[PDB]
Scaffold this active site. Structure first.
Site, PDB file in Angstrom:
ATOM      1  N   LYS C 186       0.883  -1.158   0.000  1.00 48.66           N
ATOM      2  CA  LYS C 186       0.000   0.000   0.000  1.00 48.66           C
ATOM      3  C   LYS C 186       0.926   1.215   0.000  1.00 48.66           C
ATOM      4  CE  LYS C 186      -2.060   2.950   2.132  1.00 48.66           C
ATOM      5  NZ  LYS C 186      -2.111   4.409   1.777  1.00 48.66           N
ATOM      6  N   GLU C 241       7.153   0.975  12.569  1.00 53.39           N
ATOM      7  CA  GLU C 241       8.359   1.802  12.527  1.00 53.39           C
ATOM      8  C   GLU C 241       7.951   3.277  12.540  1.00 53.39           C
ATOM      9  OE1 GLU C 241      12.030   2.469  11.099  1.00 53.39           O
ATOM     10  OE2 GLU C 241      11.539   2.980   9.020  1.00 53.39           O
ATOM     11  N   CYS C 275      12.055  10.500   9.417  1.00 53.81           N
ATOM     12  CA  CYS C 275      11.722   9.874  10.699  1.00 53.81           C
ATOM     13  C   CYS C 275      12.806  10.052  11.756  1.00 53.81           C
ATOM     14  CB  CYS C 275      11.438   8.388  10.526  1.00 53.81           C
ATOM     15  SG  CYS C 275      12.886   7.483   9.953  1.00 53.81           S
ATOM     16  N   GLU C 372       7.175  15.813  17.251  1.00 52.96           N
ATOM     17  CA  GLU C 372       7.872  15.822  15.978  1.00 52.96           C
ATOM     18  C   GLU C 372       6.916  16.327  14.899  1.00 52.96           C
ATOM     19  OE1 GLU C 372      11.305  14.912  14.824  1.00 52.96           O
ATOM     20  OE2 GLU C 372      10.248  16.235  13.423  1.00 52.96           O
TER      21      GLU C 372
END
Ligand code: NA
Ligand code: NA
Ligand code: NA
Ligand code: NA
Lengths: 468, 469, 465, 468
Positions: C186, C241, C275, C372
């Site tokens: 996806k 993750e 990330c 973040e």
């Protein structure tokens, strides 16, 4: 599908390969390489000697200096280069397979479908190892951080035989280049052509000058010079009877009474006759259990008689000529010794043609352990069949000789008993000559092939306070 | 040769073990543990709950702090500590084997020669791994030195079953401690005694306070508290699907077992296959995660196999676990006792052919007669549900292709009995199970994969002056 | 040397990819994918939903059946296929780097020299692992021969984010395929195009139908369907993750010029959309003033503009939602008392461009020091001691970095920092061979998650050493 | 805390150890072993020769036969035996340490806290490897199941030196036994006693007869006999498969930014440890010019305070050299240093009239061409050289490779040097830090130590359809 061959491929390379350049011997001497199928000279080849080897070693040493392109290059890039070399060899697959056949004598169909295919697979396998051979971080006592680094050994001397010219070259270059070593290679006087052409592809692929150097010539001269040079860090020899000697001989092929007869017969035939019997691990001692001995022997003789000997370029040809005149006569003398010693000659036994080094597929029955043909390996199309009674008995006879062995049986326990008891580097069960670029091969490839081309450096650092 | 057992071993530990000290539950509550051979209470045991677990996790976290004795300890010393623990367990082998039998019900001979032996071998095997699990130095592109360290995961919550009290404890403590983790363990209410005594030995061995903490109590209470605690880094559950669901709901791993296929081919050694199939199912009162509860037999040998199996089952000696002649003790508790009986009834109701046993083996304790059902079908409940009891199911099949599909249509373990090389390899490859045995069963060995689940990988990548191979 | 880009690349693939064929959604719905640099629609894309995922999962399952071409294929051949796919991507490198920039917004120079280069290295690295992931032969007690085989897990559901569309796809495909699994992927609605073009290359490479299936769409629908599907063996977004607030620590003895440029890179790379962005820049007090001054000047000179322009250093943020989210966060930074040193607003009237922003005197309690936002907003915090910075940096663990010339400080921090990756005197240094995680990706470690271990224990005659 | 030693340990073992029995030499000859602290004879020891070696090889070969107790034993059990041996040595630790000191001369405190501690850790380390050295299952092309087994090499000939008698014995026994090999060990004539007592503990531990055989004697005889024996499969020498483990002139590099106090003490330790009798002694101390004068001044003072005397005295830091031959060789080298122009800073002579004691000696401003900068003397003689740059020192340190060290506070300098130094082990801010787990070579210890004690067998089986 195999492409039609060029039965008279042109020779483009026949000199010394040093620093990506072609050089004549310092003495300017040259030796002839012969086509085993006709006995005629193919071409002249530079005859390397001690002084040529010294030039090669110096080139190799320079290419290995700290800060050089080869030393500074990322490990992943060494992999790229090996993959590129593989691609170039595939590009010239048809040409190389024909040249291999011309100089060596093996059937073109085999050169193409087997030799080349394995060369490609070996190089591509090793290309993948280039950046995957990890060192370790070690949990040593005290406030220290300790780790290891796997570094290249340096200048590696490689002497390869004539039985599988291209494959032997790939088996050597694959692991050596993947780990970052430099090479000084000596090819067989009987089959120097294909390796020299590959040298051209090595340059085309982009390997820095001096990374791979090839010195064609004679054993007592070039070969010995490489083995004795003081600046060579490792020497690997593969052939007849850091330093490593890879020799082969008298591998036992054990056929138990419960084995699949048809499969056993075809495999034992293949095990011995493959590549004109010129294999270090040829199953030259076929042990057959007494209950099936007679039938096995009958079928084996029939198969040997139907084996087509002829022009290696002919699609029907299963067996070409032996490599040279010396082997040709050596095999003939061996066949005579077998007759004189009381071995029962079942078929063949003589010359198969007046032109070339062709020998009829020969089969000796009722062979005994004490016989010469049961102790000496001649690398020829001569099968030895011995009778045995018990599994305990065959283990001792088979081991009383250790490169490879095989066992044919349908019984689980028999397979496991024999695979453990047989003292050989490789033990095949219901198959023979099954090598993988990933499967180790040695005597008494894969990741193990890397250990021999690497040096381990340990670094131990005092740290403030160690914690798990 | 086994030492005479003390049929009534004294209990020295029955509280909550935290920071190398014994504590009563915060609630002061206690639960009884029963001797399954008599149905009588052995003693009272502190009933740990959420607040007790919280104290245990605090102790564990403190022992795992950077700079702590456990964290600074040399890896080789963690190995020495595990070896010392094994030495102490061996010193008290006879005592522990008897306590195991008393609380669990398994035959003392087995507790001593099998359970203890494997506990010792497991701890000694793992002790050796302590300073041998290396990280790597990686040949990354560019002028960098890159390497990895295998650090411990941290606070590991471990929930163990009652079938092999001591061994399950070793199987969890071994890899976890070898890799430097700390533990908060929850033992089964049915068998808390032996693990608590080992806790005493862990303290005697020299493990720093808080490295191993044991909280006896109930599953949905203490067990769920561990699984839901926000300061627990990893939780491993081993047991019934029933409590596993609760834990899953409350790094997580659920180790469940059930309906493992034991395939007997026509060319199998009959005597060996019969004895092994019997062992495969009946071992430990049938209370094994990988019990061979589905014995598939090829048609040509079905009748003979079944006849021999029934005879073997009828001769199986059921009785006092402390008696050297006893092969089968009682089931772990009353709940399993009745659960098995209901299962046997269902087998009869569904049309399975009851060949022997099928009822209660004694008026006292939870003993059940070795039961064998013949002509079982894939659709039957006794062919789909695992009850962990002395009830054998024998199914008939014709082809090897057929049995593969039927065996896989269920994946902890499986077995194959045959003399044929090709048949052995075909089935070992085709059977979808974690462990596939050939001509044997329940052959475990302490013998690296267990270590991966207990470590965290940290990569350090350092800029360096020009790199060279 | 970067080839001139086609600033408006053609779109060849915008449908669902199943069994090496292109399919419209079962609903026939489509969604627009926008160019973040202009705010305009690039093209319509098939909107996959639950029914589409179901078709993909079945195609995957079929491709994974025992005896199928993908299952029977030699391990070495899976490697040849990975290497062929890399060759095709390299052939279409210039085109793919442009499409990545058009749909994602990152500078074309970076797409070409960084993203595409890493994609190629990742696939080629994993191609090498295909036939080298060995099982073991174990010396168990008794007369037994015991060994292990590493088998594929099966149908792997992979959800790729929008920050590095092509690279994340390669990071997922490389290990999964090298080990023989099949995939149902996806891709992000913000960046579906590049992955769909790679599917076309997957077909061209020779991968059997069903080995790789891609379903573009939305998270609550297609993504959730993959995650909940009963026939999916593994889902990687179970392994989660996530990334956030990575500390970048500058010791007083660091090389000033290097640390300033690296800290700038650490945070601003990819429009701050990483990330492991170094969004907490901890600077030792003795060098704080000078470090801040140099950092502010570097942020002010950072060129923001059309990502296809060679001089552009920063493109727009990925979408309007992120654009607004970052602006709100900057406002919260000012409201909470952080000192705004530069930037702080919109950089253009068209596209989602934000001015490179730097906040000084940040405190651990502030929202901008805890949340973040994946944007071009740098936070500079001051610290005194090494013991203090460790605690502050750990109070949050995907990555961290330390800049120092001292051996002991570097070793002390790399050990004490609770992060999956610790960089010393560098940042964002990834290698297809080095592991990455907060499960684990890249390197040999990435293979572990895509494999099941099967133990076979055989009784044998009489065992000998 | 160290127990009180018995300054006159009794000797219980002084014969040839074969099949768990004590034998006199066939010739019945014996040789005296000397206490280097007094120069007096400790006792007589059986003098093994070719004939005694032949008996030990036969006993070892027998114990290695297929089906023997040692070959059939579970791998985990080999580990149990190694741990038992370690426990027995720990029980006799105080005695062993004193006997080591009596025969070798090293300070009892060091023998107890260092040597014996390391022997225990080494054996316990390898005990754990016994059942963890796995073979592999390989994903070869085609319908085949391929795997490897790591089998023992067989009869291993082990010749150990006199510098670390017990530790060297454990470094050889550990890996060899953990992997199931059998041993024929030759101990040094200067220090045969501790190893012979350990053989007694090997018997007590339960190892089968013939698994470990020890032949005390001389190099030209017993040692040469082991190296030349046709039935010995591997020979490892420290001082068929062959490995030579030699040491010498390791460079210890002190950068100007190093911690002075720690660098001075570690450099002192690096050179003087074990009376300078260490293969990796830091015999070339390179000191950066800005800290040269101060470093030398400190090194000289530290060398002058080093306590030389009776090794049984708790204050003694340095015992005597091992024998008269080494004593003279060192005096010869000291004279060589003075004649060459090296600056004698302290020591330089005999430290006592009895025994083989030499004064801690320091030579300053040594230069690369000097013999004392090129040859290893294994004595308490320190060489201090001056250098200016890191690029310079690399080339000078490398122009010689067992070990090296760097003292610095700078990360880049430490990484630059640890990468550039061509040594098997590089220490950073420390020296002589070994772990039973970290590899050592110019390999031993760590997982790497097992590779040399094992043969790889590949078994490849034809199987029905293969699937991933
Ligand atoms: Na020729
Ligand atoms: Na109980
Ligand atoms: Na977009
Ligand atoms: Na002596």
């Amino acid at each position: 599908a195999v492409p039609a061959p060029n039965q008279q491929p042109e020779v483009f390379c026949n000199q010394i390969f040093i620093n990506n350049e072609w050089h004549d011997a310092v003495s300017r001497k040259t030796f002839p390489t012969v086509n085993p199928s006709t006995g005629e000279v193919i071409c002249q080849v530079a005859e390397g000697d001690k002084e040529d080897v010294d030039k090669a070693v110096k080139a190799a040493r320079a290419a290995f200096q700290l800060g050089s392109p080869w030393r500074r290059m990322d490990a992943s890039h060494r992999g790229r280069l090996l993959n590129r070399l593989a691609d170039l060899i595939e590009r010239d697959r048809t040409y190389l397979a024909a040249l291999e056949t011309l100089d060596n004598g093996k059937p073109y169909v085999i050169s193409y479908l087997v030799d080349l295919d394995m060369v490609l697979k070996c190089l591509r396998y090793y290309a993948g190892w280039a950046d995957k051979y990890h060192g370790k971080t070690i949990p040593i006592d005290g406030d220290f951080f300790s780790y290891t680094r796997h570094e290249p050994v340096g200048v590696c001397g490689q002497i390869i035989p004539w039985n599988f010219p291209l494959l032997m070259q790939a088996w050597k270059l694959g692991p050596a280049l993947a780990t970052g070593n430099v090479v000084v290679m000596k090819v067989a006087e009987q089959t120097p052509l294909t390796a020299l052409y590959v040298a051209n592809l090595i340059k085309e692929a982009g390997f820095p000058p001096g990374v791979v150097n090839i010195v064609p010539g004679f054993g007592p001269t070039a070969g010995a010079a490489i083995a004795s040079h003081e600046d060579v860090d490792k020497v690997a020899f593969t052939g007849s009877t850091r330093v490593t000697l890879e020799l082969g001989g008298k591998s036992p092929n054990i056929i138990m009474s419960d084995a699949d007869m048809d499969w056993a017969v075809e495999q034992a035939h293949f095990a011995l006759f493959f590549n004109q019997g010129q294999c270090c691990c040829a199953g030259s001692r076929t042990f057959v259990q007494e209950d099936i001995y007679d039938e096995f022997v009958e079928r084996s003789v029939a198969r040997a008689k139907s084996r087509v000997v002829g022009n290696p370029f002919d699609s029907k040809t299963e067996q070409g000529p032996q490599v040279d005149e010396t082997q040709f006569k050596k095999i003939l003398g061996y066949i005579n010794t077998g007759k004189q010693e009381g071995a029962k000659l079942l078929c063949g036994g003589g010359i198969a043609a007046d032109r070339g080094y062709f020998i009829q597929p020969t089969v000796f029955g009722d062979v005994q352990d004490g016989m010469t043909i049961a102790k000496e390996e001649i690398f020829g199309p001569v099968m030895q069949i011995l009778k045995f009674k018990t599994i305990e008995e065959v283990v001792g006879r088979a081991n009383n000789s250790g490169l490879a062995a095989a066992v044919f049986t349908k019984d689980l326990d028999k397979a496991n008993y024999l695979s453990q008891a047989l003292q050989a580097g490789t033990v095949w069960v219901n198959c023979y000559d099954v090598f993988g670029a990933q499967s180790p091969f040695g005597g008494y490839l894969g990741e193990y092939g890397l250990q021999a081309y690497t040096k381990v450096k340990t670094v131990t650092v005092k740290v403030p306070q160690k914690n798990s």
